[PDB]
Design a protein around this ligand. Structure first.
Ligand SMILES: *[C@@H]1O[C@](F)(CO)[C@@H](O)[C@H](O)[C@H]1O
Length: 1025
């Protein structure tokens, strides 16, 4: 059943943005003419005549479907398949079942797009806010009803005398290629529109010496790659001389063929729309880049090395770019499964939002069992460092260090307290994971999908059962290529090589995911780790990232680093640091469809692995999860839709200012690509000192890395540690190792911890509504200076999610940055210090301050007026891990000074992942709160949208700017009472000794604190006179 559509696969190698050239026309079909082919449901068919642009008399016919995906969220989809019948994918971000659910709802509401073929054969339809017309050759014009603004149009190219052809639909003549593309007009250069292009997952873009957010006027590709430092030498453009910097034309680890167009920014006539080309082969996004003649200033396009053509234009229901993100998340939603919680992404345990230390280069659990070696460290020393120094510290990322000879799902004795491997639950021989629980910590460990093959006759159950059950990727191809062999066998398996550097290496078999049976087998392996105490998963080398390898060479030999290149091309011999792209993998996109070569689907492999880990690993074997039944995944690779599996970190960065800059950019961009739980290793993973690789990250840079990283969804210090037996990396990188800075390091980790409910509530907003956690500055509306500030200003938190403004310093040795504060709202300077002193004066929005002061000990962070922020504290005043908090650790609603006499706030509550009942059975609570000021009366009102989780402890209201009241009355379903002044005179005394119904007048910080019983949380009216 192999290659059932009978494709000739013409291209196998990587093809850079310099080798992708739609606008060249030659050898390309474009849409020339059409006739109507009927409408069923919301899907119209046009029978399109494609004409060779360079020889229009050469013509083919393929049916093209136009589908209104959502009326209310203003979205439609265009799809065809030049190579076979049009097929629904069985796996991927956009499934038919969910499209079907959306339409079913909207139909039941009386939504009617009114899709019609005119008598001229023109296709027209409407959405809530938009009207669309497609002419005979596919020329498409999308107009906004309110003002009649044309907000999108596709591209036509002229011919001599054969008429205009629409390059909105393009495919290369299958005689010469397999490629596809689609071209729009691009108003980047319009004096009024000034179209901007945002999104694109992980792409890095340099402008001068600074890394920037926007993705306008550049040629990008999606080509999941083992891209260490984001600049792998083999990724260089042809004939490139000198240092290759990370930059826009280099693929990353995430595959996001997705862009948000945004025009007329900061005006009432603003428009935004997303553009998704659902394709998992190498794909491309060009936003008007003339470099290599890849594009034209006034044209934007997307395309891909292989078919089929499936594309989505997503305008959203409301004004602003965020509405585009939510609508997109809607389209990939799980409402069709009746998810009570995980609608648009999956909720993590609370513990995911804590501060995690990873290290590549640990050698034991305990100091007493650490093998002697230069600069060797034990897991124990790391925990002591953080705990003895009172760091809020969550746990560890344990690396391949703990495995038995790189065998995934194993451990070796050095990583047990008794120095031998046990089966778990033995109190006189604890694994690293068990010992870590007893420290109040949780752990992620490193899982790759390489199953060690060279075992020297020694038994390794995972590889054996992979072999025995024939679940591995075979070594078959259509090209008759020799992928290689070893003495281990099997005679018919793909065999790759894992290389960590420094002799840390092995042969590996791999799972052929598209096979039915593979996913069940994979997920079950995790039992071996969950049962010895493992809490969550850190997914690595997911490409799958293999050692560079040229066909012909022995399996363990890499090619010269300079190869391949322009003068010495791969010519289908380079493996491209993954599977040799010729290999026949069982179809991941279509179940029951045979095998295609991996070139067709490279960017789905990671998504598929995370999927299998999620469904068959974290979910189906939840029984064996020890301390928390909810688990999470942090992946290195993936594809749009990964959020229903977990989050991401941006693989191997490094320790320079630029990588701070890139980390902010990535985090913002990845968020608006609907992957919100993301971060980059804090301190950079790799060595950065060219003279001596072991020099550790400086104190100032770490401070800034930390200040920048501290509110981003995923906060981990991880690094390559130099050790005798793995002689690459730095000496150390842990926050406790910085005496001069410790007091600044510690407080920002504290600050984070205090806003643990701000982060977790945003995560709720994402799971339920798809709001991204981190907002690009351009998502703030009706402001025409945010575009300029968007590189390093990002928003988060609160009821709407624009309550906190961050503007980290992004340069080592700098005590200033230019600061922009969004217009028509007031800001309050805040940070780690302000919890224990009064707020300063309000700052006006729309102020640009050049050279705004930021000492090393500070970071620019502002809370907006009208914010009420849930805030946590330990009862005993010591710093502890998120995971060992209980409801007797105070929950405090901090009410900031009011905006237009009001403030609002929201808080999500569940058992934090202890069980999965919030997401299986609806066991969570959504508290809302509001403050209003009338004359001399202030009313603070608690309501709920559901209260199915009982907050088992007292809670507080902290009114900023309020002092002593004449009276406070509390009215609630149960306790209607007047409050009294506590006999407590300090905050620690009010927490521990204060009675429910006590208030405290806090002069030192100009706050009024109210202590309230747990039972009045879900519904209450507080009137202060
Ligand atoms: C995978 O490879 C490692 F370097 C070693 O397992 C990790 O430490 C790294 O974070 C990841 O890219």
């Amino acid at each position: 059943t192999d290659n059932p559509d009978g494709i000739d696969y013409k291209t196998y190698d990587y093809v850079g943005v310099w080798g992708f050239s739609p606008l060249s026309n030659t050898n390309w079909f474009a849409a020339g003419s059409s006739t109507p082919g009927g409408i069923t449901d919301w899907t119209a068919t046009m029978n399109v005549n494609f004409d060779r642009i360079d020889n229009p008399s050469i013509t083919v016919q393929h049916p093209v479907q136009v589908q209104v995906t959502s009326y209310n969220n203003n979205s439609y989809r265009v799809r065809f398949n030049p190579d076979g019948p049009i097929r629904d994918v069985t796996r991927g971000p956009i499934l038919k079942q969910q499209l079907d659910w959306i339409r079913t709802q909207e139909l039941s509401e009386g939504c009617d797009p009114g899709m019609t073929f005119t008598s001229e054969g023109f296709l027209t339809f409407e959405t809530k806010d938009l009207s669309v017309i497609i002419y005979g050759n596919f020329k498409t014009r999308v107009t906004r009803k309110s003002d009649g603004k044309v907000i999108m149009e596709n591209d036509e190219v002229g011919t001599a005398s054969s008429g205009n052809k629409c390059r909105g639909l393009m495919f290369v003549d299958r005689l010469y290629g397999n490629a596809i593309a689609s071209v729009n007009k691009n108003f980047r250069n319009d004096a009024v529109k000034q179209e901007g292009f945002y999104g694109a997952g992980e792409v890095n873009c340099k402008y001068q010496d600074t890394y920037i957010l926007e993705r306008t006027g550049i040629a990008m590709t999606n080509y999941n790659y083992d891209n260490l430092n984001y600049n792998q030498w083999d990724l260089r453009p042809p004939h490139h001389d000198g240092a290759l910097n990370p930059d826009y034309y280099i693929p990353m680890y995430y595959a996001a063929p997705w862009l948000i167009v945004n025009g007329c920014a900061g005006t009432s006539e603003q428009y935004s729309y997303g553009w998704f080309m659902d394709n998992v082969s190498q794909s491309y996004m060009n936003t008007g880049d003339t470099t290599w003649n890849s594009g034209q200033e006034d044209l934007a396009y997307m395309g891909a090395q292989y078919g089929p053509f499936d594309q989505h234009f997503v305008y959203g229901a409301g004004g602003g770019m965020e509405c585009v993100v939510t609508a997109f998340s809607l389209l990939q939603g799980k409402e069709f499964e009746n998810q009570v919680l995980n609608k648009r992404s999956v909720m993590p345990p609370k513990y995911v939002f804590g501060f995690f230390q990873g290290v590549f280069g640990t050698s034991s659990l305990l100091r007493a069992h650490m093998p002697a070696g230069e600069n060797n460290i034990s897991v124990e020393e790391i925990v002591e460092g953080y705990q003895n120094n009172n760091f809020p510290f969550e746990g560890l990322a344990v690396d391949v260090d703990m495995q038995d000879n790189l065998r995934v799902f194993t451990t070796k004795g050095e990583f047990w307290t008794a120095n031998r491997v046990g089966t778990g639950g033995d109190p006189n021989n604890r694994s690293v994971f068990e010992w870590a629980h007893d420290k109040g910590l949780v752990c992620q460990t490193n899982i790759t999908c390489f199953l060690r093959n060279d075992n020297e006759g020694q038994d390794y159950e995972v590889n054996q059962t992979l072999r025995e059950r024939q679940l591995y990727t075979k070594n078959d191809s259509l090209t008759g290529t020799d992928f290689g062999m070893t003495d281990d066998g099997p005679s018919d398996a793909y065999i790759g090589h894992l290389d960590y550097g420094g002799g840390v290496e092995c042969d590996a078999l791999f799972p052929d995911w598209g096979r039915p049976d593979v996913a069940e087998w994979w997920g079950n392996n995790y039992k071996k780790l969950f049962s010895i105490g493992l809490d969550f998963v850190w997914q690595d080398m997911t490409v799958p990232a293999m050692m560079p390898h040229k066909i012909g060479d022995d399996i363990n030999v890499k090619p010269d680093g300079n190869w391949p290149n322009a003068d010495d091309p791969s010519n289908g011999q380079y493996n491209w640091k993954t599977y040799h792209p010729q290999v026949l993998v069982t179809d991941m996109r279509y179940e029951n469809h045979g095998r295609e070569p991996m070139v067709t689907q490279r960017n789905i492999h990671a998504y598929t692995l995370c999927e299998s880990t999620r469904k068959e690993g974290i979910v189906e074997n939840a029984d064996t999860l020890t301390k928390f039944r909810r688990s999470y995944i942090i992946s290195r690779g993936g594809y749009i839709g990964n959020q229903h599996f977990g989050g991401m970190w941006v693989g191997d960065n490094s320790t320079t200012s630029n990588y701070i800059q890139m980390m902010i950019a990535n985090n913002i961009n990845m968020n608006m690509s609907c992957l919100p739980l993301v971060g980059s290793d804090i301190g950079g993973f790799t060595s950065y000192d060219n003279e001596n690789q072991r020099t550790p990250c400086t104190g100032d840079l770490m401070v800034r890395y930390v200040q920048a990283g501290c509110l981003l969804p995923w906060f981990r210090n991880h690094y390559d540690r130099w050790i005798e037996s793995k002689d690459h990396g730095k000496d150390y990188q842990e926050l406790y190792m910085y005496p001069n800075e410790m007091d600044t390091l510690r407080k920002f980790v504290e600050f984070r911890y205090r806003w643990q409910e701000v982060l977790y509530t945003a995560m709720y907003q994402n799971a339920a509504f798809g709001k991204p956690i981190i907002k690009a500055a351009s998502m703030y509306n009706n402001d025409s200076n945010v575009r300029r500030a968007q590189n390093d200003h990002f928003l988060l938190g609160g009821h709407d999610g624009y309550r906190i403004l961050c503007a980290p310093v992004v340069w080592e040795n700098s005590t200033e940055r230019e600061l922009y504060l969004p217009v028509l709202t007031q800001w309050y300077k805040f940070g780690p210090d302000f919890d224990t002193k009064p707020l300063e004066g309000a700052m006006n929005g729309g102020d640009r301050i050049y050279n705004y002061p930021v000492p090393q000990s500070e970071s620019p962070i502002f809370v907006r007026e009208g914010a009420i922020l849930p805030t946590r504290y330990t009862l005993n005043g010591e710093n502890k891990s998120l995971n060992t908090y209980t409801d007797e650790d105070p929950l405090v609603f901090e009410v900031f000074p009011l905006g237009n006499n009001r403030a609002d706030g929201m808080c999500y509550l569940d058992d934090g992942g202890v069980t999965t009942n919030a997401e299986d059975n609806g066991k969570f609570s959504v508290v809302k709160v509001a403050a209003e000021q009338d004359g001399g009366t202030e009313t603070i009102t608690f309501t709920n949208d559901c209260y199915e989780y009982v907050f088992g402890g007292p809670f507080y209201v902290r009114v900023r700017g309020a002092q002593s009241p004449s009276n406070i009355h509390v009215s609630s379903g149960a306790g209607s009472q007047d409050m009294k002044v506590s006999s407590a005179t300090s905050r620690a005394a009010l927490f521990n000794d204060g009675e429910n119904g006590d208030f405290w007048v806090d002069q030192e910080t100009d706050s009024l604190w109210l202590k309230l019983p747990n039972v009045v949380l879900p519904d209450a009216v507080i009137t202060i006179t």
